[model samples]
Target: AVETFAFQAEIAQLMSLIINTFYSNKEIFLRELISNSSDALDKIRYESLTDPSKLDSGKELHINLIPNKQDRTLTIVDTGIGMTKADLINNLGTIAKSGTKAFMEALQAGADISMIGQFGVGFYSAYLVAEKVTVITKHNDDEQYAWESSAGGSFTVRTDTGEPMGRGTKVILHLKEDQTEYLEERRIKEIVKKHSQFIGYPITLFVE
Candidate 1:
């Protein structure tokens, strides 16, 4: 059975703030996701230093951008440390409980991807361009799970019923009708070059 949980009260406020304040620069959503994927990659790499098995059978560490214009979806898949069910709740659900003060200060100062990631609010920026967001993640020590939300008051998490996933995270954005620009390969590559050129791992864009 899937579990549903409400966002912390502060998340509603935070979501409204981001969607309104950053509408003009919605492309930053891609940058924020890339930054998050890179961070996850960095984490698994660090952990694998001692327990080499954590590397997941020699799977090369990288990120993939799969934009399906036919489906109006943009999926950012990373061969990184995926989240456990609890990690999804604690990390994605309780965003503002601990970092709202610093996050708000950064927002006032025109936050960049670094600040967004540091404050753990970058993921919510997905809501700026997507009507719905789904995360499929598999951690080394846990079963694969899926988390989903519409940037509303509540979200859901459940054991994944889809194809088996490797040890990483897949963030799928169901684009808002007006946000289809994100599904264009040219637009995606441009954003990657502009904001994430120096990311540690290779970011490959799949073309249909």
Candidate 2:
């Protein structure tokens, strides 16, 4: 049997708000995700400071873009410490922040990547352009897990018994029909390179 859960009523309102409030600024969504990738990379690197076992020496610290126009999906893969089942629920649940006020405050403070790791749900901006979002992540301490949500007040998490990523997180966004501009590789790179070219890690866009 698969385990399913409902988002608290509090989070449902926030999800709806992101869709309504930031809908005009959907292009900024990519920047938010790339920033998250940078944060994840920093966290894994930081973890190695106290305990070396947490670090994966072989994997290069980079982010990759996988775009599929036929499927209307865009994937962002990162060579960073991935999330486990607990992390899936906790993070997708608004980055475990206390309230919307705090998130807004953090963003107004330039929305640092540390905020995403320690106090954020900024990733929800994707919902402004994607109807469904899927996350496949593998962690050092736990088995790989797949998390899926439609920003519809609920989401599902389960063990992925298939091929594992070894380490890191892959986020897939099923783009909305009206958000067709995001499907173009040129547009993706234009936005990524413009907004995050100077970020912490290398963001590679797999273009044809």
Candidate 3:
């Protein structure tokens, strides 16, 4: 079952600003994504403190970066607290509405509002380099779901019937033609070292 939702007006405006005006530093997309993955990992770990069952069997807490040149896509996978369908819509869709609203006000007033980790908009920064974004996530209490968008007026979410995934989130970014640099191992390592080197969990890039 697939359901589509229109982007909130604020979200559309936020996407416009992010993809066109705001982000001069496009490489920060990786940083934002890595940080988000780390947060998800932290959430599940913290939850496991009270409920050990929250941790999936045989899945270690870690982040994996897979760059596929043939597909021109960069996938960031994390063993963390995944989202359900509602979470997919709220987190990836409307939750950022208020945040972006505030961000826009700050923008017009010429106030420097660092929009990095705040307001859930950080995830949308993937559009800085990716033409399309796909998220496959599985929560411990919900079935696996896939969310996809092209940063357009609408996005789609559906049951993920692909390969089995443990409890976590998989974010796949289809790189734009000029953003292929992200598909290179050396480039990704440099960015990770520069920004996410001190992250708690292991962040491994598949090199082959």
Candidate 4:
């Protein structure tokens, strides 16, 4: 089990902006998430190609979409490299993001950002259609944890993340006042096709 830490005030302000403004493009939310997912899967595939046994073929590449109209949840599940506790904080709890220090050094050295790191405040695009976002992730070397927030003042992370499914991530979006478009299957699938058709993973609805 891992412990939770309070996010910096700057991070809080960023969340507020994500929910209020940056997330104004609700349709792009799926694209943003799928793009992030593809990045993870791509890394593993690249590693396996180089290392041969870096991955198990038994583990196929796939993305699951579980739409919950009752609770108004839009779940995006992925079979890709997951996150550790530190990653959760770094990826979801920071306003500066992972490569801020490098970004500054590049700028100071007069290096153009034409091909550099660009989080672009992108991950929070989830909030575009979600008042509350729940992230369940399990890294290869760490335990699974459930991180949740609402762009509100407080967020929580718990150790028990339901059943284990090897390594991957699932983002459950609890739609806010104007964030309901994401709850539709056609809308989500369309966005995926538009932005992630070449992701090399099976991206489709998962309903039972």
| Candidate with best TM-score | 3
Which parts of model 2 are misplaced by more than 4 Å? 50-52, 93-97, 103-119
Candidate 2 lDDT by residue in tens digits, 1-208: 4678898776787677777753355687788888888878998888888887675543478889888878888999998877767778775434444755576577676773233334466687778789999999887888888898887778888878877677898999998898989878778878976778689777777865
Ranking by lDDT: 3, 1, 2, 4
Question: Candidate 1, after superposition: displacement of residue 45 in Å?
Answer: 1.1
How well does candidate 4 score on lDDT at residue 101?
A: 50
Please give, for residues 1-208, the per-residue lDDT of candidate 3 as tens digits.
6788898787788777777774456887889888888888888888888887766543599989998888898999998888877778875533686777777777787754345466567887788898899999888878988899997789998888899887888999998898888888789889998988789998888986
Clashing pairs in 4: none
Local distance difference test, each candidate: 0.80, 0.77, 0.81, 0.68
Task: Compare the candidates by lDDT and give the number of the best one.
Answer: 3
CA lDDT, candidate 4, residue 189:
63
User: Which pairs of residues clash in candidate 3, taking residues 3 or more apart in a chain or in different chains?
Assistant: none
lDDT of 1 by residue, 77-109 (tens): 988888877788885544556676688777678
TM-score of each: 0.90, 0.85, 0.92, 0.77
lDDT of prediction 4: 0.68
Worst 10 residues of 4 by lDDT: 112-121
TM-score, predicted candidate 1 vs. hidden true structure: 0.90
lDDT of 2: 0.77
| Sliding window of 10 residues with minimal summed lDDT for model 2 | 112-121
- Cα displacement (Å) at residue 23, model 4: 7.5
Misplaced by over 4 Å in model 1 are: 93-95, 106-115
- Better by TM-score, candidate 3 or 1: 3
Query: Judged by TM-score relative to the true structure, which candidate is superior, 2 or 3?
Result: 3
